Design a protein around this ligand. Structure first.
Ligand SMILES: [Zn+2]
Ligand SMILES: [Zn+2]
Lengths: 310, 146, 146, 310, 310
């Protein structure tokens, strides 16, 4: 009777606060003593309708490391929906009669929400539906902050970079606000402003935000800094003006940077981040990267087993 | 003043020039059974208004609330057999599905055989909707093909 | 005659539910004088009908002209205060003026700002209309069809 | 003061007999008789929005020959109309001026009556619009009519290949549908066999016009053989299994013609005609189509001079 | 012996008042008065490396009209310059000869002073280089100045759309910045609102030049309204959310103009002007821009003849 059981993975604002804790409990237990069998037989279409390195692979590794047999597509072409002109619907509609779960990713907004109307019993998980959401990065970010930083409440994070499109933050951002104790500081271009549909929230949610145009400003402040790659392929030919990195973190920026504070990038880093910094202490984007295995594994298990694990 | 109906529904009090729209947008034409739309007419309770009187046609409460946004204050004199029998309000509903046309081009709410559906909620001086598919919440105005 | 007013042309004998366009297609529904409708009403000719009530206003010319292909029996009753007089007949000029949705996607008169004109070889058949810029003689049926 | 003067050159189904013969006669007289000191003023531009070899060089040339020059452009390549940004009309607005006279050749129909709407007073001449009309590519052959049989009256033509599309033969069953005692011989696949609506204007006099079998048999009955290229470059996908003329022309089948009947073609030619056709007292498409000189000039003049005689 | 003769036609900010009026007057006199027996020798080539409709046909035509011909090429298509292989100069080296005169239109600036470096003695004329200059597309309107108000002195212009890029209006606040009592009315987004450096040469006399709000309000103050197309085809990505003129022109807003003020445009036009503008005692861009004839000719002559009068 596990909670997330048979449940679907789609938008963090479809859950709550107390809801998370469950996978995380699952997760901290695996980073410890695992179970290479726990999800045998199981078949998961790892169909990705858009590019990706870390969200797909890691996920297959989160599946392979548990015993679940998988066969999904990397490129949304050599499939009937490709040159055959088949609608996602049918495409899902049928794939759902072959696998016990679909862990997709799709170039358009909420194409995930699509799946479920043609899924039902069969669990559907999203690796980001257009700039919209990516409920799945928020979780690995979730493991980090809580891991590298004791408590999960009473803290402040500096979300900087393409926000208008960062499937990433929307999720995470909206996630945190729900917790008792988390101030928000958004640093973004004039255009790439963090979509409102998240702004208003904190407000009512008593959670307070503020916009700044410096890295040093909230230097000694923010317990954590979330940088973002710029949704370059995800852009209308107007917003294209503020294309490049209006913000590119460096070394010396780490002067009055708080000890426990670290840099977190859901990768890949395009120009926003320097390589010399990987040597530094905060350098954790990378460590904030290998978390998925754990986050996605914990997560995978759950939905795939009514009974709690170990 | 139109006349006097037999059995069906009637929308006493409809914002001027708004009765044409709540009709033209909707298939209140598709319906063959006789319709006497009184666009622009005297109010009495109010000053000016519009009064619909679609007969044989019955609207329980889904197509009732959907008017909250449009005609704020209105009335359903649900006259069944020459006698008025209606007590329903155009409440703001959860979410009005299959009707509007999404603003977010990239959203996946049209490009597929799927229908549409935006969540209703009251923001500030104005109302603003969120398309469930792509979690986006555009203003109750921008949601059209203009 | 009946509930008729003083000055205000009334459009009778309309093909069943064609009138609905006369307000969106023709956007005549943007006025502040009387406009009491009643489509899908019984008729003593063939099938059913639709009528629009106009107060303080009548028809015009291009509206006498668009009536043509619009309706065969269309008998606009122009009433000069309770007296129907100009029961003019729907007749469309030989010349076609910028108000049509042409089907010859070839005649570049589509994607470039122009003046929508055709032809109309009135025959004891349909209200078809030969192309003006392409002289390709087709039939309003489709051209005008959805 | 004459009928064929300052006349917008577009189509041909709206003029009376008197006109052609008019210019037609000026051509028998412009067969070899050059007059420079005449319209050596009125500048003209060669506006080629499509691709036809003869009409282009043939035209621009008579433009040259009849004492003058030719500006224009071979294609909508380097023109503020697209690259920059302008409607086919805007261009005209300013075009009336400079080249008091210009010829328009668009890959879309109706355009004539358009450019011709954005000039004011300055004279035009569209020798082919989309695939609906052509004024100058008829008369030039109407010359070839007197070249083969003199009298244009009663005869028996023939039009192979594509006949529905082409902006050339569109003037056939329309310019002569007002002549006298003429017999129409058509040849083209169903949709191509020319629409019945170009054929419905001839209901007031109801003379000849029919369609049957292959060239193999209608050759010992033809007084005039004028095929037409199958407009391969302009049509509809909905019918793509017919790029081939179906009915071809080879000495092999033609050896049954009348006596003065000659082989003519709209030009360009491909399979319509056989290279072994060159050698025949009939193969006249050579000089047939090549009247632009003696031709065009005849009308080039007339539509730009007052009370002039030749 | 005159000032405006054999002068390399490139830019305009380096000449004195005396010049324009000079040719300007030759245009009031070349309004309808053709002289063939004159420069019927000096051959010219129309070298179009870009795409503008008027200036091209308008030019090549006056080239024709003023007794002569025009070679040139519509594009760098079939030229040994690229395909084969040659620098914009090498070509010139040999170009000076043949067409003693040629006009250059490059999609890159500075090039003028270049081709003009590889000629020797043979006269040139660049009517627009990249997006920095234009000599001939100004005077022709400077004609329209006398057509609308005669006196070019003190007035109140206006330039909507793109004003920083365009090689056309670049000569504005530079040719008149040496005239008299004139008031400058500009209209263009920040970077486009014309640089302050074209505006810094006017520091020696410091007369008028400013920028404020929308056309809606500066219309009941304008004596001359000359917009300019938003050079959509030439700029920088760094600013792509501004393909639209922002401030448009419709009868709707214009019904507040002065009295002799007229609506003019650089051409081509797109949204800048409304098709419903055609009907106005002001919409003059029609004849405004259409002076090339009466115009160009005036200067075409003067820069190739000795002590001549008209
Ligand atoms: Zn949506
Ligand atoms: Zn057309």
């Amino acid at each position: 009777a596990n909670p997330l059981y048979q449940k679907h993975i789609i938008s963090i604002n479809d859950l709550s606060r107390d809801d998370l804790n469950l996978v995380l409990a699952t997760a901290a237990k695996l980073k410890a003593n695992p179970q290479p069998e726990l999800l045998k037989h199981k078949v998961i279409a790892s169909c990705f309708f858009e590019a990706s390195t870390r969200t797909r692979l890691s996920f297959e590794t989160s599946m392979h490391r548990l015993g679940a047999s998988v066969v999904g597509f990397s490129d949304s072409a050599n499939t009937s929906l490709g040159k055959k002109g088949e609608t996602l619907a049918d495409t899902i509609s049928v794939i759902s009669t072959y696998v016990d779960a679909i862990v997709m990713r799709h170039p358009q907004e909420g194409a995930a929400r699509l799946a479920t109307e043609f899924s039902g019993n069969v669990p559907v998980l999203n690796a980001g539906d257009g700039s919209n959401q990516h409920p799945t990065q928020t979780l690995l970010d979730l493991f980090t902050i809580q891991e590298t930083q004791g408590r999960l409440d009473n803290l402040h994070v500096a979300m900087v970079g393409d926000l208008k499109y960062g499937r990433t933050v929307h999720s995470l951002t909206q996630a945190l606000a729900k917790f008792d104790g988390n101030r928000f500081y958004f640093i973004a271009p004039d255009a790439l402003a963090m979509p409102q549909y998240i702004l208003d929230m904190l407000d009512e949610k008593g959670i307070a935000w503020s916009l700044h145009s410096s890295i040093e400003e909230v230097m000694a402040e923010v317990d954590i800094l979330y940088m973002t790659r710029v949704q370059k392929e995800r852009l209308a030919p107007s917003e294209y003006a503020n294309v490049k990195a209006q913000f590119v973190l460096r070394a010396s920026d780490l002067h009055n940077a708080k000890a426990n504070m670290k840099v977190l990038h859901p990768l890949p880093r395009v120009d926003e981040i320097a390589t010399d910094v990987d040597k530094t202490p905060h350098a954790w984007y990378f460590q904030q990267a290998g978390n998925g295995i754990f986050a996605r594994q914990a997560l995978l298990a759950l939905v795939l087993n009514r009974d709690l694990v170990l | 003043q139109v006349e006097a109906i037999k059995r069906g529904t009637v929308i006493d009090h409809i914002p001027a020039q708004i009765g044409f729209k709540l009709l033209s947008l909707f298939k209140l034409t598709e319906t063959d059974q006789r319709i006497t739309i009184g666009l622009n007419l005297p109010s009495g309770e109010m000053g000016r208004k519009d009064l619909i009187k679609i007969e044989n046609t019955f609207l329980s409460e889904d197509q009732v609330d959907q008017l909250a946004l449009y005609a704020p204050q209105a009335t359903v004199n649900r006259i069944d057999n020459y006698e008025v029998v209606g007590k329903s309000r155009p409440s703001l509903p959860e979410r009005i599905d299959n009707v509007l046309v999404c603003p977010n081009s990239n959203c996946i709410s049209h490009a597929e055989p799927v229908s549409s559906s935006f969540a209703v909620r009251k923001r500030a001086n104005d109302i603003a909707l969120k398309c469930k598919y792509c979690e986006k919440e555009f203003s109750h105005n921008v949601v059209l093909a203009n």
